[PDB]
Symmetry: C2
Subunit: 226 residues, 2 copies
Amino acid sequence: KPKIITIASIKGGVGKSTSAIILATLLSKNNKVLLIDMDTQASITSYFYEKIEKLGINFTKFNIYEILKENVDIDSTIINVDNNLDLIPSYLTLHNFSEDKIEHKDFLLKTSLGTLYYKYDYIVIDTNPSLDVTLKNALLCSDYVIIPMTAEKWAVESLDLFNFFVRKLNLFLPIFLIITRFKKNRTHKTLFEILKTKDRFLGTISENKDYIKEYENILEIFLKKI
Amino acid sequence: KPKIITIASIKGGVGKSTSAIILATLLSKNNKVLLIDMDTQASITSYFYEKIEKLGINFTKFNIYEILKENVDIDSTIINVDNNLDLIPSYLTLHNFSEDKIEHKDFLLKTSLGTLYYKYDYIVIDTNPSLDVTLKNALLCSDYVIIPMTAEKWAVESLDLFNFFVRKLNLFLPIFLIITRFKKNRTHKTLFEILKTKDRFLGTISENKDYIKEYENILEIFLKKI
Ligand code: NA
Ligand code: NA
């Protein structure tokens, strides 16, 4: 069975989707990885758009929302975008999902992944920065959550809120933390000193490169802790 | 009765909240204006946070979500932040709203504003870039919508989607358009040539200042057209 990681944040602008791309890409080097763009903003899909255009994929018809609606089969949406890196793209129609009236709505992605799953070692799911039914679908499939967060007003309260949300879903779902946009010269490192003592704190990403090496480090620590 | 303007976009990163602040601030110069932050990300509230801290307001207890939940009275949340500019702040707890089970949920803001309204000439409501029940609450109170949008993949499709959403609410709600981050040197001005022929197209904002003057222009055209 694949290990399923949701990349989440209920704050926008914390490099959620960047983290998802990079961690997934790193995992793809020695594992088979599916990346699922479940973000209405579709940043991961935009990042790979060039490659998707070259293959002439109709992601208007073949996308995560059309899977959730059971209008297409999951396998027909899967796009190879890098070596050992497959992608299910998002499209703006995902915006309707929260309003669609559907039975057993929370379990639609869990159902769909079950028909597939076994081809993959990891599934990394990128979600909207909202507590909504799209997120619940991700969380109910997942084994782990990684939250990239930034030193900001209300960061710990936001984290508490997200945690509350997970419990009220009735999940026992471990959440691992990264501080992104990390400012080594910051005067009051108030988030770092709160988070650093937590067992699931992975590390910081500074505000071929030294960027990727910081992610490799985070990833190494995560894979060690799980 | 106040004229109620929802500032919306289902794409993030188009200066939705910046537009809301600036248009509202301009309207406040010769009118009494209430700004409502109904965005889970709370950018307008962050913008005014300094002023809110100086007044020692507990926006943990007194905020738009607590109004929607009927735990506090609207008037007890209102914060004066500039001359003729009042503010109802947002807080991260707004994230739970989409999941709260509540009767006549779509009309909660409309109900709350009715107990107040009459003190104001304009109410400007900033919303999340999501099609959800928070947005519906805004739209059902509104007389007009202004959408600041950017030259991007899927812009016209996103606009179509938003329009579909408004009709399915059963509203006859005019939508006015701005292109923000406008690049006068752009090679293919494909959005501008589509939008420029529409009667509700207000104009462009370029990527005391010349910035405010472009907004004044947009605002003048809007007030002329309505
Ligand atoms: Na939605
Ligand atoms: Na929500």
